[PDB]
Amino acid sequence: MIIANADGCTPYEVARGVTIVRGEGAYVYDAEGRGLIDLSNSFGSVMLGHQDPVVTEAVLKTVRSGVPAAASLDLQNHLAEQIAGDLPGDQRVAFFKTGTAATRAAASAARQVTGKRLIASCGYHGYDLMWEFTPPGQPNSEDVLHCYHLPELIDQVLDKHAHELAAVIIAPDYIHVSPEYIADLFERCERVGVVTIADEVKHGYRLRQGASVTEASVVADMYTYAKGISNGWPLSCVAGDERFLKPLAEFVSTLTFEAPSFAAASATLDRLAELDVQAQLAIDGARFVSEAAKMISTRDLPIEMAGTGAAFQFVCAEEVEEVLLPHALAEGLILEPSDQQYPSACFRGEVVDDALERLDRALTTMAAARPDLVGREVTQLDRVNAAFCQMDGLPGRPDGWSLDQCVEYVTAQL
Amino acid sequence: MIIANADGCTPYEVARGVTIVRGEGAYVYDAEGRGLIDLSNSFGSVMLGHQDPVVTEAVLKTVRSGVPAAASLDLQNHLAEQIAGDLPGDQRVAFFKTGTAATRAAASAARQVTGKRLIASCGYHGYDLMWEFTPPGQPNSEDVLHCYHLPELIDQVLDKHAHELAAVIIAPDYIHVSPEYIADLFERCERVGVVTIADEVKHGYRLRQGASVTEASVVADMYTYAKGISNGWPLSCVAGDERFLKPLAEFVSTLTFEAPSFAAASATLDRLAELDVQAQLAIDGARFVSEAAKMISTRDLPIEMAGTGAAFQFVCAEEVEEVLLPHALAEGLILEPSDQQYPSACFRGEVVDDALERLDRALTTMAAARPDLVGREVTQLDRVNAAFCQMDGLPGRPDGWSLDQCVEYVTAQL
């Protein structure tokens, strides 16, 4: 009502008809005491699980100490060392409170160093007007051009503007395109001498202990993190070469160095390593996705599974998704719509079996409630729409599509 | 070392030679167990005192519930009602995590509604490049003009640009200028139809239970808050008329609605009201400042007290400040340099007497260590420098100064 910015783009929208009051591990609990397996995890900000006991103990002890902001420089420096040590090369780290602040800061540093203004972008980099999507070839109000993960559109912007780009910022994604496809986007920009920013806000510390692009054989001038590093506490950063981080020396807020979020983040990174989280998720998520695909097949429902491990998606028509999501919720399974799912470290062992049993029940009630969906086919356009929702770009030019058709498609999505 | 943005602009710089490990009430404690009266309070973000028991209980219970982000819409809405109810008129509220994010968001909303780009500004609005100060008449890289709180420079920008300004953003201040002076800055802009943003990040909920400008008989289109509302937890907001808050509907981050900061803020506003904090600070701060002025006088030291209540300043030459601050620290009194002090709700009763006894001892050792300062005069330029540091602008045109001299002075400060 009176909150202006509580519309969409908030997690748990599927549950807006129920009341969530508690979270613990892989589960959240509604007002009636029912437990729901959570595959939203605050849009992937909770990588360890709700109320992780080590993170919580670290936060509680920091709160009880009352230590004020910007006094625990030892802890702050230790966290910067943790982050920099997981990236190849020599990095400095500048801390922020949201992913949007980190990506705008990285863009601002590129502008300061290069003396140029134009930025090219693939993917979603946050809510700031500078990241507002406009059609290909049309700079937005803050002089950002959007290329929708297509190498042909990157090539077009580089052909016309390589000499005047401050930077290219790319949010990687690997559900609908390969690591090699993503690496190719970075390398096109590197070959013409343009600064690169790997926006790892979503995938940093989710797919491996560090930046996802590192395993794609990419190195970038600057990296931005947020969701993976702090288990739901507001902390983000830009990590990158000294030349780009020096312009961020005065990019400080009163509470940049409030202590509880630093305690949470340092504990989170340690716990991710101790519990082998990303490698175990690769195993447990792959089991979930494989078994989910089998259950879908035996029921002839029009859903395809895409991705694996820590990042997978139920690919289907919007009409089908609008049935799957409530049926899953009725069986105690929270899914995010129009996006990947975001399992946490607690999505292991018996929890995966529990989630599959709930999905099994949901697919059965869905087939019985909506028998007209049984036998429906998943179309190319279904898959493209699902990819565009998840990665905010096209998964390469779809088969049989001209580049002009790609441009008209993305224009129609805005 | 490896943290890029831990240079200046962090609080507690006077204490960088000592190690602070605990905070409670009006005091912080170093590693050797010594208690120091804290007049920084994380640059004024702690308005209740460190480890306020009601705020801490609220935060601890929220952390222990594990409730994930954007599920406690009842608490989020309640906080928005609290904030909107303290402003005259009908406001909506958009939440952010830092004061910089709130002021950039307010500026962005003005740009969206008006379709104009240029912004005029008085004061410091955060670290973003859009708030980087440039000399009068020179737009910065994000099309912001700076007017340094001078009505003549506001008039110049309005004369040249009133028709194309998206908004004027003014950070009020009342130590070196009157409420009537500040009101005059807003009214010049209102008279020519330009959108006004009152940047209350520093003074909101500090000087009264709401926006400081309200008591100056000012109403603004949008208000920004941060330091006063959350006792050191990262939460800020834009509050304003529906027409300006509708463009901020999608200005959301993953953790915009993380629950612990909302629990802290709602508890903070309630505690400020229950403990009559701002009115009691007006009384206790006035006693401190009056008695400090008397102690300074009897020792003939070159310091003047400016302001009163919740916002006062030790006005002196930089050479003198560099002696006062360490001598105060040696007696267990933490002061911020080149700025106002920021007493909290715990700066009452016996704590004020304790602070005066410590200041008394510091003034004595300072006179004995540096007898050459005794009898030195405070100059007009000392006062102007102290004002420029504190309010990031000129306190009206100083006596005997031409406008050209004012412009050259501020240019030399950048």
Ligand SMILES: CN[C@@H]1[C@@H](O)[C@@H](O[C@@H]2[C@@H](O)[C@H](O[C@H]3O[C@H](CO)[C@@H](O)[C@H](O)[C@H]3N)[C@@H](N)C[C@H]2N)OC[C@]1(C)O
């Ligand atoms: C229709 N136009 C839209 C525009 O609304 C806006 O879409 C965002 C969308 O990107 C956001 O998802 C993205 O970020 C999430 C947050 O962490 C990740 O979790 C998702 O993986 C990722 N896809 C969504 N949460 C909220 C939408 N508002 O940008 C794209 C556009 C094509 O221009």
Ligand SMILES: CN[C@@H]1[C@@H](O)[C@@H](O[C@@H]2[C@@H](O)[C@H](O[C@H]3O[C@H](CO)[C@@H](O)[C@H](O)[C@H]3N)[C@@H](N)C[C@H]2N)OC[C@]1(C)O
């Ligand atoms: C020399 N040029 C400078 C420039 O550095 C930069 O100064 C800021 C200064 O405004 C910051 O104080 C301001 O905000 C604080 C934070 O809450 C309030 O507490 C202070 O009341 C308020 N005065 C200071 N904390 C850190 C400095 N870096 O903007 C102005 C300039 C003239 O352009």
Ligand SMILES: Cc1ncc(COP(=O)(O)O)c(CN)c1O
């Ligand atoms: C890839 C990516 N980049 C940047 C952002 C912006 O981060 P935030 O929502 O914390 O402001 C997001 C949203 N989490 C994102 O998905």
Ligand SMILES: Cc1ncc(COP(=O)(O)O)c(CN)c1O
């Ligand atoms: C008046 C005012 N406006 C805006 C800001 C920016 O707020 P933050 O440091 O939280 O980003 C500040 C700094 N606290 C400020 O003093």
Ligand SMILES: [Cl-]
């Ligand atoms: Cl922020």
